[PDB]
Design a protein around this nucleic acid. Sequence first.
RNA 1: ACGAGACUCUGGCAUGCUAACUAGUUACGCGACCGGUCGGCGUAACUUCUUAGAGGGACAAGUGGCGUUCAGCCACCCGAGAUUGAGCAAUAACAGGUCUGUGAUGCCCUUAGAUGUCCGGGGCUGCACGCGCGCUACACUGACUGGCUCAGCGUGUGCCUACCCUACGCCGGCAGGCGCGGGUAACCCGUUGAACCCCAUUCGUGAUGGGGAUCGGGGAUUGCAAUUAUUC
Lengths: 143, 101, 138, 72, 62, 189, 144
Amino acid sequence: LVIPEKFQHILRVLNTNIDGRRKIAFAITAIKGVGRRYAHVVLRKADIDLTKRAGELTEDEVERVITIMQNPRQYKIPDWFLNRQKDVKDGKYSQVLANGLDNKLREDLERLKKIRAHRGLRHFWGLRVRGQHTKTTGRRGRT
Amino acid sequence: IHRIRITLTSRNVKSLEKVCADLIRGAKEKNLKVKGPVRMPTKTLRITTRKTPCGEGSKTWDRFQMRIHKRLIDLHSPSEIVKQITSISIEPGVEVEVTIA
Amino acid sequence: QSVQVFGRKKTATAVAHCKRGNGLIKVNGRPLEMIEPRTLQYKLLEPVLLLGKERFAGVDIRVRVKGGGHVAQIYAIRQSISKALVAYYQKYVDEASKKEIKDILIQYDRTLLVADPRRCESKKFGGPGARARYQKSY
Amino acid sequence: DKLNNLVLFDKATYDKLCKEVPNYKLITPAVVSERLKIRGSLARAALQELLSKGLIKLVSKHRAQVIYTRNT
Amino acid sequence: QPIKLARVTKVLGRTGSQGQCTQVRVEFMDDTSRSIIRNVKGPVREGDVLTLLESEREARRL
Amino acid sequence: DIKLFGKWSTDDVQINDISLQDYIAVKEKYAKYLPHSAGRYAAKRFRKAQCPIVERLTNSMMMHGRNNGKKLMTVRIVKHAFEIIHLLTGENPLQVLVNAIINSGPREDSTRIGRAGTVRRQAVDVSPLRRVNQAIWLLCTGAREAAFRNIKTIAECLADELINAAKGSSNSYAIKKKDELERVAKSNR
Amino acid sequence: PGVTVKDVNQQEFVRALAAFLKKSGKLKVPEWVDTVKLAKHKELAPYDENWFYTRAASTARHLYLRGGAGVGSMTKIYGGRQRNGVMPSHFSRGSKSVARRVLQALEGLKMVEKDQDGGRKLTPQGQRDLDRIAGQVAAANKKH
RNA sequence: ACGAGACUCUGGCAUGCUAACUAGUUACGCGACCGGUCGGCGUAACUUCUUAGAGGGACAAGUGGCGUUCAGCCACCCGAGAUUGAGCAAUAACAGGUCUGUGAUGCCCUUAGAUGUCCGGGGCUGCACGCGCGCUACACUGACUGGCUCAGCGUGUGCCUACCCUACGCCGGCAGGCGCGGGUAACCCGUUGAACCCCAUUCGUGAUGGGGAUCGGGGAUUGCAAUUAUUC
């Protein structure tokens, strides 16, 4: 039906250029830390009617979704389904909106390049390390 | 034990058939109740190798095949009579085993 | 007690155990119409309306089928049912009705009681399929 | 940037959805979505809603191929 | 050109660079006094009817 | 008393072409409830033309990529789009398809020039069998290109393409390619 | 009269068993309903939110069709296609823990339960109730 | 005379035969309503489905057309089948490859590198690059719990060595560990419950739930260390 008040076309979570036409859980995938499966789980836990889009809903739903997002441990989401688990330096906690931890997980990459490590220098040179062979990569648009 | 099992394992069907016929002939010489020779499915050991001892040429593959044939007979006879029956006439190529049933 | 008639298509094979009854048809825990595909259903229904419900009203045949694939399991249930009916009629009641039903089934489909001889062909090295060959550069 | 097709039950959506559509025998989501310039999802939702309104009978629907047949 | 069908009466043989044309005698069922050679395309049996909106042309023969 | 699927009858169809009637099978003993029967039609000549026209038409539906070898999907998309043509027209779908095939099966087109020659082309009669083959191929290909890069799904392009081929609308690929083939035949005398 | 399990269209039959499981509540309440990815091969979201109830009903269907099924087997009925990314697809077993928890939800509840020696025993209460559900589905809107 | 063919193994038919609690069809103690689902069993009708053993069967054998009125080809009542697929495969040869299989080999290495013992570490996993095989995609014939239905080839308990297939319950969304073990195998995996067909709820022409280094962090195998880390 036609809602007579507060229809949005540029939806905004945190400094993110996302569409307002996109279905809910199809536009909130723009978070560089979580999305898709994690988004589906979070919205199904927050008790939102999936059969509606991202515009025909009240502000309270988005508010509570954001609160459960920024506080995964407060609302029964395990310490296995998320991408800030303990790592080098100090363990990371809390996944925040946009590249709030993507910057945190790129600064470790910066550390790896600054320490002159084989894996680190290969990351700097543009050579993938997790098991990627190189026979045709770096052949189109190479320097 | 009363239930004796005679196992016949042979790669050659002709020798296996002759051995089974000889065993049934021996069990017909003396009146002994016998179950017909049970023929189990044959085992085809298909293994494929490269023809050439090097890498040169077209893709040529030897497909070697070894077939194993299985016969089982079950009898009600004492061990002495079964022992006398078994070693009455055999032909090389067949393996005969006596088992407790 | 079976009419000892069997029926095949591809590696699949079906036999209709037969007894005196009132034309209730069952296929491995299910009747002839609740088979899953619901689009091949017409293929299973082919005989029972090809010759009518009355002929399937004085004999109970249970079709047991073992084989691969869905559709290959079909063409075995139906052929087994039809050939079981024809054999039951031939060996029990008469031939005139049996001959009539055989002519009807053959006219509708000559491969209604004869098996389909075709089987999957072996694969030869230097190619993925029976007749397909590996690509090479000249 | 992105092509615009209506994802809401709007004035154009409410217009000729319950009075003029049944006059056409071809009632399928693609035709509706093309006629009133919406997505396929909204056309399927609209036909589901009008079916729930008890207007037109169903023939079949697998996932998106749905047939409606009239009575007049 | 007048429309007049022709029925196949004898399959003469194959022609063409790749042997795809088929020479066949075709007769018109109006006088049974004319039986012209026609080259035809595709699988052709014996005894069918070929629709002919054009008949002023002949197949190479003899 | 055999009806295609459950409601299509085989007594309202008429060929009225005399050209291609033995290579179209809808009214004769070739009547069946399911357009899926495999068969041995494609293992010998003089027996390939005995396949029912609807069976051949559904056989040639699947093509390209994984879509090949999915005859059951073809049965589904053939019961679909046939319900659709019957609701759009109200006429018997078999006679509409026969009309489309008569209108779409090319009569004359070009091949090599008689005894020998490859520089150009020479017009010859098209066999009825090859013409039904071509008609079916154009129908399927036009339908799948109509679905290609389009909002509308399958079971629509088949339906509209078939109905236009029956009526002669230029949006039909089959009969427009037909007229194209006869134009090449005329231009290559 | 009497009507069994296998002579009922399995679609609405398993729907009816799922609805009966929701209505009963005699089972252990599921503790994971959407926090898991279910099958190992499946890296896409579950939808129905009832996969514990529906999977319990499916398990019951599979022990009625084939008595003696358990976990290790239940994985073999719930395995599926696994797209290995850039490589082609294969077959993957499901989650043995999920099927195990489903069985433990069923186990000892007086319709089905798996022993420690081999096989499945079916109590009169469960079989009577399930046959009645099948008969109600058949004669309600599937047979007149 | 060799080669071709013939040949052998295979693929298809025998309700004909020798016959099988390592296979099932027949043997019934809830007959659950007063004729029925079973591999929910409600714990001696014998080889028909299964098993390849011996025979049989197809030969252009009958009809018609063409054809030296031959050899043969084409079409058909009939028949399981009217061309199954492979194996082998002559005379001669190639400066084809193989000394990376060995006292099976004709030449150099004999003066402390003679390899008959040995390697801690990196090499063909890394590069301005061109090439060859194949896969994942080319759409709304596609997808977003998949809910229900099956077979086929065939491998598997080891003395150079725990170095197998694993049935069942416990630990966790997870790689993996524990136990009792079943299987030396038509005895157990296994009735080998994947691919698929469905849906009276959710994708809609993006650059994306049609998609991959989805960059980086959480994983680990009764066995030398997973490093541009071929396992996850």
